[model samples]
Target: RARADRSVSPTDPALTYRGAVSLQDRDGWLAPWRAPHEDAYLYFPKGSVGRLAQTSGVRLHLRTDSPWLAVRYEAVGPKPKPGEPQEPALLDVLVDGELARTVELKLDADAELHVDGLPAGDKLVELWLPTLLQFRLAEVRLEAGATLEKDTSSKPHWIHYGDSICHGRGAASPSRTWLALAARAEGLDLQSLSFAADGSHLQPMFARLIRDLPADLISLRVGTSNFMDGDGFVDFPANLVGFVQIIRERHPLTPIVLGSSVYSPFWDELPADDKPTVADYREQVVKVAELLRKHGDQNVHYLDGMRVWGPERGMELYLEKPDKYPTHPNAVGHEIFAESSRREMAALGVLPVR
Candidate 1:
């Protein structure tokens, strides 16, 4: 029987999930939760680090000599959205910015993940999560005698908008996504606002939303899905002028990078519904860049995704490996995407302060 009147011991002051260890990026929207681990009273974001600090852009950093560090959180899987990753959420453990391992969250329940084994000296530990899905966090506990050095906080960075590829579906880990890698190369903080649209929506609300966020840079990678799904309905190019206008009205000088569709599968019998093909994506993405120049907006720029992940390399940068259906990139693709992006940004002088 669950005890409603007894004081819980596991829920102690020592186990509180505080910023002393978390990648502090929450906006004042902190809330509380009651859990067996105790000290669950914290801003358990609807899901992960971003938008409550989107998890993908966030990292959980801890310094300790403990043999084990326990992470308590509730997993909420994602729905089959338009450009969102349909797979279960994943968490990654990095020791000193290097990939250690990935934790696949497959259940919709409370889970406690442990980082085990450590030598005598203190070590740096970082944890990253898939940001889009709503995940509530609880408490963290480390073995006795292991002290955590928490002082991590987040800062304003660029905001990226587009579909799953930008959302990081095909990468090996959260940090390895092409978008993430590129941002890091330039020493830029990134906030991914991309989504797998239900119908390449391009809803007005998105434009409005962008006008409200704070970022030094803006990158929009869209249209591929829309073209493939339109069946003659999706008209991203026609709407490009307005889209750029909306953002410009808000961010007059912020550098804007417009990326068309990347080189991904467009096979009629494949992911898309036998509609607009590859050329459509290539033509339109480049068009927007031209349009920006046509609009007299000097800060506007563009990236031909096809060139980044397209025909030159056989579009291999768009998928996982051997053969994964649909679009998306694996670690190799992620690397190339970032490499291409870094080069483009450098040439455009939009590189962040390193």
Candidate 2:
């Protein structure tokens, strides 16, 4: 039977795209922006797409087995960097909180990707979006009756702002990222504002985004990028203090957990020419917490990165080649970090353990 399909916007409140943190309601489609960019793109990328779900927190949750589910939009061929895979963006589908299918979105056309032959019954279907590229969700098309069994929720969600470390660049998949893993393990809702290729540094622009977003709790994992550059370390303490001030101005007393830098081989390894060593980075980050109390940013608490992933792990979880990108974590490392965060945050009276 050639059943006629129904088209719905990805921004539909009931659809529940969890990890898509920043979204723009376009004249034609709802485009999800991965990181907060002050200037919108003047000209869309010619052969590439971004912000669909290419980071830690982006996900889709629903409860229907729609026939021929799909998203319509322009596409781009895969042009992965030197060490990255040529593989296209992937989606992790879970049925009732269990892995069911993994699909690839590598096509270059109007129809981005499609899934068929869903079981005939009322089943929970969650489509985890890609964490690498952006695709204008022109519209999501599905068969009829799929719209009725939608996700209607009334719960607070967490908003995370940081660099790629907290962004899940190390995880093999979105669900596997440290933040995502912890949220799922604890049954927490998440909204991601992390960026890849951009080191986690505190910027004034961040204050505006943090001010406007709605969240019960906020987390930070900055200074890794500043650690990479020596000068950033010099201004890091001041930047850290000011960052907290801006956030507090809007979200006064919103349990802000200040996550310091995570474990990296750079700390244990010898110093590089232009990059600051791990010890230098750690000392400076630790200073941020100390200064916070002096400056009266008491609501903000610090969580050490080493607690998340450090020497105790025996490099089992870090990226294979420690030298190239020692700071970035692997899938295993991400899991460890997630678990540590849950425990530490729980201990600090942030939220009840899941």
Candidate 3:
């Protein structure tokens, strides 16, 4: 009774799309934009910020009996400049909550990422999309008549906003980013609204986006991108306060963790300008959280950036020397940060102790 093969639309109702702010339908493909596509210009004026919004932490979850899966897609984005490490375009395949494979994708081709040897029986399938590239899927292929249904687990939603580090830039794969790892460990659903090139500037539009989203918990880690920008430093505290207020308008009681930048030796220990270092920004962040709490909003939580990544891990985790991307943490660093953050989140009661 089964056909030989089946080609399914990425937007199939049987699949559950997770982590994307919105999915934009391209003529024959789908682009998962972390911000609303229709009003993108109003919120994301910078070309790079708008583009990086397409990066990091979008995933698909479903239950299927198919023994194999293949994804045919086109990656539409700018290639790295010569001599720069090509921004990773990869896919992480997880079956029944275990990582089964990680496939490195080649750019601009009508290419396919194929997975074989999935265990028999209906099993949970998760496809973690690549970070740093805009992928428009043409189709997802599976064996004909395979059982497919949306995975309906009621996991707590976590929305994290940050910069390049949170964008999973230096992680080994899409699913191993610090935020991703922590979310998985905590068994929560996540939306990583991290962008590159100073994109996490705590813009008013971003606050509105977070305000409107459904979130059980929220986190902000934006200061790193603004540390050197004098203009960004000027209103940093005001921005943090206003941003939290906007979200409070909608999610008044939801736990909000306002985190400072993760450690950066170059920016923290020896800075070109010490006027507004990471330490200074962290002080401002802690103050805003305290201020909000004093105003009777006890849901606001302050997280020291050092708790996530500090001086001790800087020598080993910083990706600057080898990757030449200053301040970003590599895969191991990301993992350690994940463990540390999970502990912190639990201790602060943002997440229940388990």
Candidate 4:
């Protein structure tokens, strides 16, 4: 006979979910997403981009004194490539908002990720889910009779929109993403709407989603994906203006920082063609912010992507995966990007310096 099993409900009240637009109920498990599965599927019937909407910036928050914890989960999407040493899907367990442990999860197996030796006494525990992999949480287990409380503190809500760079392309784990790191440094609640390469071209659906969401501060980093598009190229400038307009319609006074693509020799160093170059993209993005400011939208600001990742440091900063996109920042670069971005955000007044 099967042994009696007891695990805390995936949706237990003691656990407070954050960042995701919704938690999809999958019978005994919960899948988080920045958009509802139906709406995401409707936007991208092709499926890949829709699945990406489920993982970035998704995390669970809890306050407990348990000495150990376990998460029983099942993977659903493509397993992290085997034997290639790619950054596999994993969890970044944070204690009171500081990284305490990194737990690797097997992509091909149903298993329980156990985290032990959490600091004694009641403390905040954050379970950061995979940024690129989709998984369903079956249960969250803690030591019997452990003291558990809900983390009810309020923080500034920030909605950041960008491409795979922000989707955490080269970061080692979910919480290591530059945007996630920056958010943590600033102590803000972040909702990351970063999709794959072709997914974040300032689509109307994305703009509408941002307009309808609650946000205290907003940032948009795009244009890299469309820089190389032939036909879609011409509409990029207008779309950038249009996208900002949609968000402005709702958040008239909200601080909005428009960041151009980060330093990438692939695009920035490439010779100009009929398509817009990285410099062209940066000019247009800056112009939008200037135009908005002239129109009395003083809250809109501009952040130079180069300030976050300079071309001079490309050799050491760029992710060196031969077959993968080489422009993304590697683990060390993500850390530097996080620090630089935090400074830039503060200078733009989107975030206050600590």
Kindly report which residue stretches of model 3 are placed more than 4 angstroms away from their true locations once superposed: 1-3, 49-53, 79-88, 164-166, 270-274, 322-326
User: How many residue pairs clash in model 4?
Assistant: 0
Tens-digit per-residue lDDT, 279-344, candidate 1: 666577677788778878788887776665665665545554555564566568678778987777
Ranking by TM-score: 3, 4, 2, 1
Tens digit of per-residue lDDT, candidate 3, span 125-230: 9998888677778788888888888898988889988753445667889889888899888888988777663567898888999999989999888676787554
lDDT of each: 0.59, 0.65, 0.80, 0.79
Q: Against the correct fold, how does model 3 do in TM-score?
A: 0.92
Clashes of each: 16, 11, 0, 0
Two-way TM-score contest, 1 vs 3, winner: 3
List TM-score per model, in order.
0.70, 0.81, 0.92, 0.91
**All candidates: CA RMSD in angstroms?**
8.1, 4.1, 2.5, 3.0
Q: In model 2, where is the ten-residue run with the lowest total lDDT?
A: 40-49
In model 2, which regions exceed 4 Å deviation? Answer: 1-3, 11-13, 25-27, 35-38, 41-56, 65-68, 73-88, 117-120, 164-170, 197-199, 272-277, 294-297, 321-327
Residue 211 displacement (Å), model 1: 2.3
Candidate 4 local distance difference test against the native = 0.79
TM-score leader:
3
